[PDB]
Design a binder for this molecule. Structure first.
Ligand SMILES: [Mg+2]
Ligand SMILES: [Mg+2]
Lengths: 57, 144, 75, 189, 143, 145, 64, 68
RNA sequence: CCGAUAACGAACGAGACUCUGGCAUGCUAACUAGUUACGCGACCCCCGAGCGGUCGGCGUCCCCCAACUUCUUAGAGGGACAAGUGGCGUUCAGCCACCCGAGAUUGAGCAAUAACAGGUCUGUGAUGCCCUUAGAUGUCCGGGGCUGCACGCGCGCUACACUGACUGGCUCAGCGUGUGCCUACCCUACGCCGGCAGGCGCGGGUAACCCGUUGAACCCCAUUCGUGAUGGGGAUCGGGGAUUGCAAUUAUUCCCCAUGAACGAGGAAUUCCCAGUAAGUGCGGGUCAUAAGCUUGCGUUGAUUAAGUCCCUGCCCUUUGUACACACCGCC
């Protein structure tokens, strides 16, 4: 999961963006669920402009 | 002699009640909703209507005809819109049909007695939030 | 402080009191005359307009909730 | 000149002591034909002082659930009371009210949070603004207490309250509480 | 010295016209006037025996101000307030047939006719009296 | 004029199986009769053509008995068929209106009729429980403790 | 044997007190003597210039 | 109270004062129009906040040596 | 944020932003909004005015056969930025008072890292694992149940009365909805019958075109009530009638007539709140075949105290102590 996310996050910055953040959560490793957040660049969350500044999936 | 194009329609609004005053050259006459001012339901607040004419006297109103229509708000909001309309139409009539020095010596007495006559009240309402029944009241909470 | 037991109908023992000095004070009101004569108060209103018809009592207000009488012009 | 309710002009009223002079608004500038104005007096601290006292009594007279926005009923009650007190005494209703305000405001109180003496511990005197505010509140409450379950009406109750207060006879509710507050405060000096 | 109904007090105007209809006995009155209420919400029958002569007087004044009124317009004008006991109060309309028979009765005095569209309005015949009565009560009130 | 009390003013009257106060107004004084309500009282006084403004105690004896038989017999005196109490009788089908203790024992007769047929409403009545389907979770506790 | 009620005019607002802020502490100067001044605790809103009643001569004066 | 400016508005104010000094004065109304053409301010409520501070620093700049 | 500063240069959050409200007689506009003027009228004045007054009566996009946006609506824009004066301040950041100003703090929406064994597998053709799978935990139908009552708690509605109830008269709102792919079910003017719920015939509206100028409530103006558990309050219960549906009993709801229960302002405690605020007071939408005491919003009337504090309950930064780290509901 981490190795794949590194290639994805690298490719997004390769194509050209101000920042990117990926969060993968669930039944990773053992039974207890955990979340991994690879975040880089700039990433705002508050206000009106986040509506048209982010691509969320 | 019978000159046309002497009419100013200056409004006054208070608590959603928009009031239109029609000021015209002619005999001294005051009428709102096709009714005389003294013939109106809130006799408790009749002096609010009589307030501007009591401050300025009927001598200035002699050459002025007033016809007011109001289509909004509540009872006393309609009244406060009416009295604002009467004064605001009059000062504008003196502002563009005689010298505005006369407009000044009629504005000073009104503005020193009550600012609401020539300044509208900006406060309207507030939205009710889903934490309580009112705009700021919150629903009563319990712990046990 | 149990009951007022006010008299709904005039008796002569107080009717003469009504006719002598009830129109003698400025604040003659239906309520004041009700507790002064131990009369009901509906009777107080009804009889007060009787003295109004006799013209010895002067009115000022005539309100549906607060009607105010007074004595004649003395002096 | 102003003829509040068509009579009872404010030119012939006075305050007997200079402590309350700045905050009583029966002045000729603060004279109003009618005691009703949505003038945004309470937008700031000390900005309610210039509001006319008659209007302050009007606002204060509505309480206890059934009377919270009803100002038309309040003005008609106060106006009928003013004609009543002018009738019963023969002088200016505003002059009777001003005498009542002076005579009803307690000159001292007491407040503490720890182990109080009797009700509070330390006696602290009041400001002229609290003198006025406690006076109006006391007069309004005295009227409501009297006419709860009897045949008397509110215009009468406010009338006798002002009459007993403006003179001082130990029968008005306002001065009865003024006696208690001053006695306990002296006990808590 | 012109007189309009809008120039006089409406409460005293309807009082005058109530007696005017009372003396002119050309007004049809049903047999159940003494029994039923004026509205579904009103708890008690009206105190006045000539309530029909006041309702008919009032609606004539209403038709002066704006025509085209029908049964729905009347029952919305005369709608009151049903306290419903322990339930919260709700606004309730008046009686349909009471207002319907009043408006039907005004053709018996020939002062209300149906418009080209829905609803009905005053005749010029009735409008003549509605101002004449305004003149007499205005003078009596003034003097 | 609000004249003085008449000599033949009965401070309490005696109608059917009850006594009314003559000090209060006649319109609301005959509502003290068990079975006579507010609206029924104000219409039989209109039919009897009595002066409403008077009190109950000054009614003449012939006025009282005339009103009594008006309220006793509703059908033959223009009282509406929809104005009664025992309309469309369970027992004998007739449109009657009862205004005395006979209302109580008629109500008892209907009540014991439901219990004799052991209907659901009757059984709940026999148990002292509610019948109008209302909840018993949190109310009605004053009649129990 | 007794002292009559006097009045004093405030000169400045020093600071709140009472461990709730429900009282203010203000320096006043006597109206019987301009050179006589004390500091007193008074409840309610107080500003400069205003004059307040005084039922007793010296009660409390503490530096906060 | 509660009107303290931000590093965003202040930094732009220092930038434009020492780059366009000759084109600025002591009028809020004039300078807010001056900032329109040299600076691309996306908010109407922000462009008068910059200019309001610009006149503030220009009152001081006529008396003392500001760090800019 | 200014400042110093072994830190420099940044980033998110705060701010900033969007929406809403407050002024724009400045611009564009309008038969799905009107307003002024003119002409027909309708009525009153008439002694006599005569441009006398009123009309939500008709007209002047019934296309050449009046204009305008002030009120209405919605776009482009403007407008307030601590701008100006004084005082305090390192005179920096900034703070207070005042003039002019519609506005000198309008309300929200969004909202950081990190975490909770907080809630949802009963929102899903989200889902792992386990269970069941024809005598089924699938699935359909009939009935009952979810309502059931010696009691305790919470969210609320109605009250306790005259600062009121009833009766009649006068008479002012803004949110917003309205006829359906499945899926049948809209909002309603007008007239007539009935006392009422309702019923019938007729229109309009897929909507600034019609309901609707939303004739709301509160409130105001007069009558009665008269301090009584009274005409306050209407709980419980009987009888009768209608509406929705296949079905109303365990009363769906609504209407009328019947009895009129406690309740006379509420002990220990405690909730919410600083201006269009609370409270009063109704009106929309959601739920709906039938429906609101709930909830979500709107409107009307409209205050008192306060421009402070750490006292209680807590929160943030720094120092401090710790035998705590499942973190004081700790450990012992
Ligand atoms: Mg933000
Ligand atoms: Mg009765």
């Amino acid at each position: 999961v981490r190795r794949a996310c590194y290639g994805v996050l690298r490719f997004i910055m390769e194509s050209g963006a101000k920042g990117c953040e990926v969060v993968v959560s669930g039944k990773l490793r053992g039974q207890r669920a955990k979340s991994m957040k690879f975040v880089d660049g700039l990433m705002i969350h508050s206000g009106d402009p986040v509506n048209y500044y982010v691509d969320t999936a | 002699s019978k000159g046309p194009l002497q009419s100013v329609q200056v409004f006054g609004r208070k608590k959603t009640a928009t009031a239109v005053a029609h000021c015209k050259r002619g005999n001294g006459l005051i009428k709102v909703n096709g009714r005389p001012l003294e013939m109106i339901e809130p006799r408790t607040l009749q002096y609010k209507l009589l307030e501007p004419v009591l401050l300025l006297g009927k001598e200035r109103f002699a050459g002025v005809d007033i016809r007011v229509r109001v289509k909004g708000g509540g009872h006393v909001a309609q009244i406060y819109a009416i009295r604002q309309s009467i004064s605001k139409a009059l000062v504008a009539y003196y502002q563009k049909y005689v010298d505005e020095a006369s407009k000044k010596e009629i504005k000073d007495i009104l503005i020193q007695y009550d600012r609401t006559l020539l300044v509208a009240d900006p406060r309207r309402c507030e939205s009710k939030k889903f934490g309580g029944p009112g705009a700021r009241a919150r629903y009563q909470k319990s712990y046990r | 402080r149990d009951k007022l037991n006010n008299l709904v109908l005039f008796d002569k023992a107080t009717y003469d009191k009504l006719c002598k000095e009830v129109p003698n004070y400025k604040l003659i009101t239906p309520a004041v005359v009700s507790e002064r004569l131990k009369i009901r108060g509906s009777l107080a209103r009804a009889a007060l307009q009787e003295l109004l018809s006799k013209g010895l009592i002067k009115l000022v207000s005539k309100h549906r909730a607060q009607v105010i009488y007074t004595r004649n012009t003395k002096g | 000149d102003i003829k509040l309710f068509g009579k009872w002009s404010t030119d012939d009223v006075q305050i007997n002591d200079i402590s309350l002079q700045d905050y009583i608004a029966v002045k000729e500038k603060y004279a109003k034909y009618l005691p009703h104005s949505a003038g945004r007096y309470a937008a700031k601290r000390f900005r309610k002082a210039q509001c006319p006292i008659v209007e302050r009594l009007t606002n204060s007279m509505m309480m206890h659930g059934r009377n919270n926005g009803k100002k038309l009923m309040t003005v008609r009650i106060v106006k009928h009371a003013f004609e009543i007190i002018h009738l019963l005494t023969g002088e200016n209703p505003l002059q009777v009210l001003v005498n009542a305000i002076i005579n009803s405001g307690p000159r001292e109180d007491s407040t503490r949070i720890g182990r109080a003496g009797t009700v509070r511990r330390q006696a602290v005197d009041v400001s002229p603004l609290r003198r006025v505010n406690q006076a109006i509140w006391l007069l309004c409450t005295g009227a409501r207490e009297a006419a709860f379950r009897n045949i008397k009406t509110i215009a009468e109750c406010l009338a006798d309250e002002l009459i007993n207060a403006a003179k001082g006879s130990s029968n008005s509710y306002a001065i009865k509480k003024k006696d208690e507050l001053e006695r306990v405060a002296k006990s808590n000096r | 010295p012109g007189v309009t109904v809008k120039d006089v007090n409406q409460q005293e105007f309807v009082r005058a016209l109530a007696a005017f209809l009372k003396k002119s006995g050309k007004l049809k009155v049903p047999e159940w006037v003494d029994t039923v209420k004026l509205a579904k919400h009103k708890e008690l029958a009206p105190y006045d025996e000539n309530w029909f002569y006041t309702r008919a007087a009032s609606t004539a004044r209403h038709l002066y101000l704006r025509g085209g009124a029908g049964v729905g317009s009347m029952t919305k004008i005369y709608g009151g307030r049903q306290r419903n006991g322990v339930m919260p109060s709700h606004f309730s309309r008046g009686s349909k047939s009471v207002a319907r028979r009043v408006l039907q009765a005004l053709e018996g005095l020939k002062m209300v006719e149906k418009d080209q569209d829905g609803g009905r309005k005053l005749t010029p015949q009735g409008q003549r009296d509605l101002d004449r009565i305004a003149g007499q009560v205005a003078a009596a009130n003034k003097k | 004029m609000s004249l003085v009390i008449p000599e033949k003013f009965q401070h309490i009257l005696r109608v059917l199986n009850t006594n009314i106060d003559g000090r209060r107004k006649i319109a609301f004084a005959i509502t003290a009769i068990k079975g006579v309500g507010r609206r029924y009282a104000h219409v039989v006084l209109r039919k009897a053509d009595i002066d409403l403004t008077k009190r109950a105690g000054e009614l003449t004896e012939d006025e009282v008995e005339r009103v009594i038989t008006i309220m006793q017999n509703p059908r033959q005196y223009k009282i509406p068929d929809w104005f009664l109490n025992r309309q469309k009788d369970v027992k004998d089908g007739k449109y009657s209106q009862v205004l005395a203790n006979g209302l109580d024992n008629k109500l008892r007769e209907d009540l014991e009729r439901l219990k004799k047929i052991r209907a659901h409403r009757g059984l709940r009545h026999f148990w002292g429980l509610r019948v109008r389907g209302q909840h018993t979770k949190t109310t009605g506790r004053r009649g129990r403790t | 044997r007794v002292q009559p009620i006097k009045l004093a005019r405030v000169t400045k607002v020093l600071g709140r007190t009472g461990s709730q802020g429900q009282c203010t502490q203000v320096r006043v100067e006597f109206m019987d003597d301009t050179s006589r001044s004390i500091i007193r605790n008074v409840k309610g809103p107080v500003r400069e210039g205003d004059v307040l009643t005084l039922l007793e001569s010296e009660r409390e004066a503490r530096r906060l | 109270m509660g009107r303290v400016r931000t590093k965003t508005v202040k930094k732009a104010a220092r930038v434009i004062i020492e780059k366009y000094y000759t084109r600025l004065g002591n009028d809020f109304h004039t300078n807010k129009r001056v900032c329109e053409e040299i600076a691309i301010i996306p908010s109407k409520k922000l462009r008068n906040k910059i200019a309001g501070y610009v006149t503030h620093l220009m009152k001081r700049i006529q008396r003392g040596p500001v760090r800019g």
